[PDB]
Structures are given as C-alpha cells and as structure tokens.
Nucleic acid binder design. Structure first.
Ligand SMILES: [Mg+2]
Ligand SMILES: [Mg+2]
Ligand SMILES: [Mg+2]
Ligand SMILES: [Mg+2]
Length: 688
DNA sequence: TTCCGCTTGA
C-alpha cells in the first residue's frame, strides 16, 4: 500500500511506536542530532579551512551562515536512513516537539534530501488515539523555531570559541569558557569567597529544662526544653543577628551574652519558678511533593541514595531502556490520568483509603502554554511492584532498584492526602533576681502523616535543617501557669560560614536561575571537574585557583557573559525569534557587533562581543589578571596567588638585601582549599 | 586548545 518512514530520536520509542503502528511503517531513530558545527579545525572541509572563520564555523561576515557537517559518530546512522528513504512512499519527521527537536527534523531534511512528501507531527502520548491524532493532522516545519535553535547554537559557539582564547593568553592554555560552565564555576567560586571573607562570632544563651506536672499532673509531656530569648526587654542575639564579619546587624537592639554573663543569669535564677506568658497554637497542612522531574530526581538521589549526577542518570537510562520508568530527561511534573488513577490505586492498597487524597492532585509548571513531556514515573498503566523490580534486577548493582523505589514512592506520595498537624509558640517569663528574662520554645505535632508515610524528602548534608516528619512535642499550657526550673545550662555557640555546594544544591541553583537543561545537569558537573575548575571534597564541590583566575578575569572584563541573569535574558530574546518580531540575523548582528537591544548592560550596548574581545587582547595585563587577591600580612604587604606553568603558586613582594621588590614565593597544592588558606597557613609554607 | 544540547552505543 504505502511504505512510510517515521523518524524519532529515541530507540525506546522506535520498538514502542512500531507496535502501535504495525506493518507499512518503518520506525528508526536518529539518536539525537545528526549534524553539528565542526568541533575542531580538522573537522572543517578542505574548501573552508582557508576561510578566515574556519575556527568559528560561522560566517559572521555573511549574515551568520553556519557550516553544518555530519557528526562522525552519527555517520553510520545517516547511511541507514538514506537507504530506507529510497524504498518508501512518504517521510514522517516525528522528532520531539521542542526547539532542539524541530531543528533535528530540519537537519534530517537537509541531510536526507527526500523527493517524497514530508509530514511533521509530534508524538507525546504513546497510544493508538494519540498516534492517529497527530498523524491524521500533520503540520509544517516551524522555521522560526529552527532560526531560534541556530541563534542559540551560534551564540554558544561565539561565546566559547572567542572567549576561551582570552584565557589562553591570560591564564593557561587548553582552558575553556562557556555560557553555562563559566557561570556554574562563578557560583562555586562566589561561595568560596563568602567562606574566605567570613568572620565567626561567639554568642551564649541558657538552655532550661522545665516541669509542668506540679500545676497539672495530667500533662504530656511533663517536661520540655526552652531557650533564653530576652533579658530586660532586650533580645538575645542568635545566628541571624550577626553578619558575615562578626558584627551585629540589628545594632542597638540585641544583647550578646558571654560565658560569665550567662552563667550569672543561670546562677541567680535556679530555685525560682517560671510563668507562662502566652502559648499560641496554629494549624498547618503540608501539600504532597510534586512528582519527579530531572532536577528533583538528581537532588533526592544525591541526598538519600548518595548517587552522583552521572550515577543517577546512568541508572535512569537503564530503567527507561527496559521499560520501568518514563523519559528521565524532563522538566515537567505532570501526570497522565492513567498514572494518576494508578498511583491512587497502589497507595490505597498500601495505606488504605484514609491516606488517599480525596481530590485529583496535579502539579503543573510553565514554558510556553502547551510546548511542554511529562514527569518521571513508573511506566505503563499498571505500576510494576518494587518487589518484582527487586527480583528482576539482581547482581551487585542493586542501585537500579534503590532508585526505582524512590520513583515508585515519590509518585505514589504525590496522589496522597495532605499532612495535618499543629505548631506551638510558648513564651515563658521569669525573674533572674533583678532582671526580667523571657524564655521561648516551639514544637510541631504531626496529627495526620498522610503522604509522609510513603515518601519524605531528605535534608541536605551540608545546609542542614529539620525533616518534614520530625515531631517536637510540647505540653498544652495555660497563660499564667507556673513552671518549675529543673535544669539550667548556659551553652555557648559560634556562627558558621556558608555551606559548600553539593551536586544536589548546585543543580537546584542552576534550575532556579534557568541555566542548563534537564539533559545537561549531569554534564555540567562532569565538565567543570574535567576542565580543572571544581573538585569534590567527599560531597562538597570545592573550586580551584584556576577557577579563581578564570572567573576573576571573566567577571572583570566580560561581566555580562557570566551574569546569572544572562541565560535567562538570552532565553527571552530567543523566544521572540521563535515567534516573529525579531529576526535571526538582526539579533546575532547586535550581539557580535553592537546595537540598540537588550538590557541596559547587555553586550549589544557594550559594542558587541567582537569589540569586547579586541580591547582585552590589547589592554589587559595577565600579571594583574592572575592576581587572586587574598589579604595583607602583618606589615601590610599584599599576598596574592598566581597561576603559572608549573602550577598555582603563592607570591608576595618582600624586601631583600637591596630592598624591594623581591618576589617571595611558595607552592600550592589542592590539599589546602581556598577557605583554609589563612594568613597563618600562608606564613607557614612561606618559611618552609 | 575551546562551546551547548540532543541522544545512544563505540
Ligand atoms: Mg529529544
Ligand atoms: Mg542553646
Ligand atoms: Mg495542640
Ligand atoms: Mg529582543
């Protein structure tokens, strides 16, 4: 009848689509992109190597015409499709329905060059009605989307291949700089600077255990603990009252109790009774966690299962290829009605009708009205039991089930009832001899666990906090009730520097800033580690001195290229290209040469990217760029770190026999993190 | 020397 060729991007869809379609339909896969810009000069065809832009791959002097070549990894895949194209009646371009997927269909047109009719439709749901809906109602190739994808491609190409040579002439060779990797490095570097410029401050208070069984034996719990809050109408300072330099923020508003000060208030207080001023309770209701997307999956697998980004997505790949979970590269949290009414079934069989939500639970996001797959959840209409997945997946690599259980529990919890409870706020007054003291304590009750019986989020390893199912019981006291002082213990504390970035906390920061995509979060963690900018200290992402010099040079003379707002603002200028108003050539002309467009501080206002690199390969001294300013010594001589041929080395200008300037230097290895390089540690390795 | 995004086997 009619041999029709359907091309998707995933082989898992191929065998799946070939079942709902049947005979006559040939379903093959491209495995992503087939064409890309030449990665190096060796990939440029011979007739273009002499052209003065073969290093870029884009003809920036002729309306930004790229040089698309077949990527050698996808070379054999192209030959298979060209042969299948010779013996078919029509060609169906059924790639994804996003910006990158639409360009692949256009790349398939330019590469295959068919003479048969071509239809462009998108398959979201994999069902017989959804297959018959998009196929019977085709569509045209969105050229505005392809021009937007090209504009994103050429942008990242001009960014990376023009700014990286700046690092080669100012820092070290073979270094890289990108719209994503340089900003991710800039985040980890900025956090380390916060820990380096952090001055701790000590503060004290009183921890008092109390008793209420005297005035009310029928009380539960009979005892509880409280802390000191106010002394003589003046707040007791805690962590939130000190800034990054140890000074006070509230100014003349709080007290700073010391050891002798607190032990005196605890001394002249025991033996007396405390009076309950107020005890106001308040109800609350926690909504269930949304289903797993790519970011939240990597976060929870890092906090609970201690998996890395590559370890998580490698397991999710095998789980998807074997038909256990859906597509793991997604930015959506939506569920199909088959998955909703199935998670409500498994939850009811496991926790009864008491914990199942009485209302349909759906958690939607945004992108472009209807341009945005679904969440990561167990595939099929009937969820495979985690017991059967535990059997079918044996071997020492049991991680395939431990990650599957998380997806099976998280999805079930999304369709369960809320968590009902109450929280207290006790204000306890007293008299410490001649001064008025105020004690305060708070607790949280979990009357109805709900979805917390199936899945509970894990706290961060470094940030630290309270679990969402942790209870803090307190007795119900009456205003005016008298409490006995069981124990008084003045404890001392100190403010701690900001926490390092984990692989989970960094991905959470990238997704919130709009940087990187679900299919790139793992590659970002790998890239900044392979380029030599970030290394792991157990679970913390620690920067390097090369990362300080690269980020420092970038944030000085290429400030907008490393701004967190850049990718978000570039995405807004890209969404207009995909809808009209602006053109592909006009926007690239402003970004590379200059124009009236963008935010006030954008690159088009600064004279384009070409002129921005020209004034930096001319009016920049690498000796000042390789100067990571640390601090001054006891004599006021500045100490800075320089990055050389041998490696990162410490340096300051000291006096010698004839005086100054004698550069005294030392060596630095990655065993001393930047926050651990104080003036004492610096003076140690300076001597010997 | 170098980019970001798409997706699997070399
Ligand atoms: Mg795709
Ligand atoms: Mg305390
Ligand atoms: Mg209560
Ligand atoms: Mg615009």
């Amino acid at each position: 009848s009619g041999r029709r060729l359907v091309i998707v991007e995933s082989p898992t869809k191929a065998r799946k689509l070939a079942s709902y379609l049947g005979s006559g339909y040939i379903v093959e896969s491209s495995r992503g992109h087939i064409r890309d810009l030449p990665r190096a000069a060796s990939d440029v065809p011979a007739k273009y190597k002499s052209q003065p832009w073969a290093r870029l791959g884009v003809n920036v002097d002729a309306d930004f015409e790229p040089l698309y070549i077949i990527s050698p990894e996808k070379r054999s895949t192209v030959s298979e499709l060209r042969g299948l194209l010779k013996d078919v009646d029509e060609l169906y371009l059924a790639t994804d329905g996003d910006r990158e997927g639409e360009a692949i269909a256009w790349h398939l047109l330019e590469t295959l060059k068919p003479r048969i009719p071509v239809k462009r439709m998108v398959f979201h749901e994999i069902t017989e009605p959804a297959i018959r809906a998009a196929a019977e109602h085709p569509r045209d190739l969105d050229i505005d989307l392809v021009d937007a994808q090209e504009t994103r491609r050429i942008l990242d190409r001009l960014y990376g291949y023009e700014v990286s040579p700046v690092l080669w002439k100012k820092v070290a060779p073979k270094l890289s700089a990108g719209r994503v990797q340089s900003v991710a490095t800039r985040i980890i570097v900025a956090r380390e600077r916060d820990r380096m410029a952090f001055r701790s401050a000590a503060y004290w208070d009183i921890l008092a255990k109390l008793d209420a069984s005297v005035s009310d034996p029928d009380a539960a719990p009979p005892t509880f603990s409280a802390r000191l809050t106010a002394v003589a109408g003046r707040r007791v300072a805690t962590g939130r009252d000190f800034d990054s330099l140890g000074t006070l923020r509230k100014g003349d508003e709080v007290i700073v109790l010391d050891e002798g000060s607190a032990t005196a208030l605890a001394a002249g207080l025991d033996g007396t009774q405390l009076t309950v001023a107020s005890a106001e309770e308040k109800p609350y209701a926690r909504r269930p966690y949304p289903p797993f997307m790519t970011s939240t999956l990597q976060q929870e697998a890092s906090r609970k299962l201690r998996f890395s980004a590559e370890r998580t997505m490698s397991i999710a790949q095998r789980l998807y290829e074997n038909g256990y979970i859906t597509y793991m590269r997604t930015d959506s949290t939506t569920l199909s009605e088959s998955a909703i009414n199935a998670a409500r079934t498994q939850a009811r069989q496991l926790y009864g009708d008491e914990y199942v939500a009485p209302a349909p639970r759906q958690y939607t996001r945004k992108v472009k009205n209807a341009q945005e797959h679904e969440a990561i959840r167990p595939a099929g209409e009937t969820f495979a039991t985690p017991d059967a997945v535990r059997r079918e997946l044996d071997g020492p690599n049991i991680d395939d089930f431990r990650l599957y259980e998380l997806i099976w529990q998280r999805t079930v919890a999304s369709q369960m009832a809320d968590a009902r409870g109450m929280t207290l706020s006790l204000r306890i007054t007293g008299m410490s001899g001649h001064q008025e003291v105020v004690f305060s304590a708070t607790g949280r009750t979990l009357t109805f666990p709900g979805f917390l019986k199936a899945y509970v989020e894990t706290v961060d390893e470094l940030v630290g906090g309270e679990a969402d199912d942790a209870e803090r019981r307190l007795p119900h006291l009456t205003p005016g009730q008298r409490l006995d002082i069981v124990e008084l213990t003045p404890d001392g504390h100190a403010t701690n520097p900001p926490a390092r970035y984990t692989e989970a906390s960094l991905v959470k920061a990238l997704e919130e800033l709009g940087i990187g995509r679900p299919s790139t979060y793992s590659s970002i963690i790998k890239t900044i580690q392979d380029r030599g900018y970030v290394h792991k200290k157990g679970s913390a992402l620690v920067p390097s001195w090369v990362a300080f010099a690269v980020t420092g040079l970038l944030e000085q003379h290429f400030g907008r290229l490393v701004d967190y707002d850049f990718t978000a603002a570039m995405e807004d200028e890209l969404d207009e290209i995909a809808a009209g108003n602006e053109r592909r050539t006009n926007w690239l002309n402003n970004f590379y040469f200059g124009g009236d467009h963008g935010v006030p501080d954008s690159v088009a206002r600064s004279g384009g990217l070409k002129k921005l690199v020209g004034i930096n390969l001319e009016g920049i001294d690498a000796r000042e760029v390789n100067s990571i300013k640390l601090f001054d010594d006891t004599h006021g001589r500045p100490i800075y770190v320089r990055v050389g041929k041998n490696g990162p080395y410490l340096e300051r200008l000291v006096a010698g026999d004839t005086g100054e300037p004698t550069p005294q230097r030392a060596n630095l290895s990655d065993s001393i993190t930047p926050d651990e390089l104080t003036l004492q540690v610096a003076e140690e390795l300076f001597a010997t």
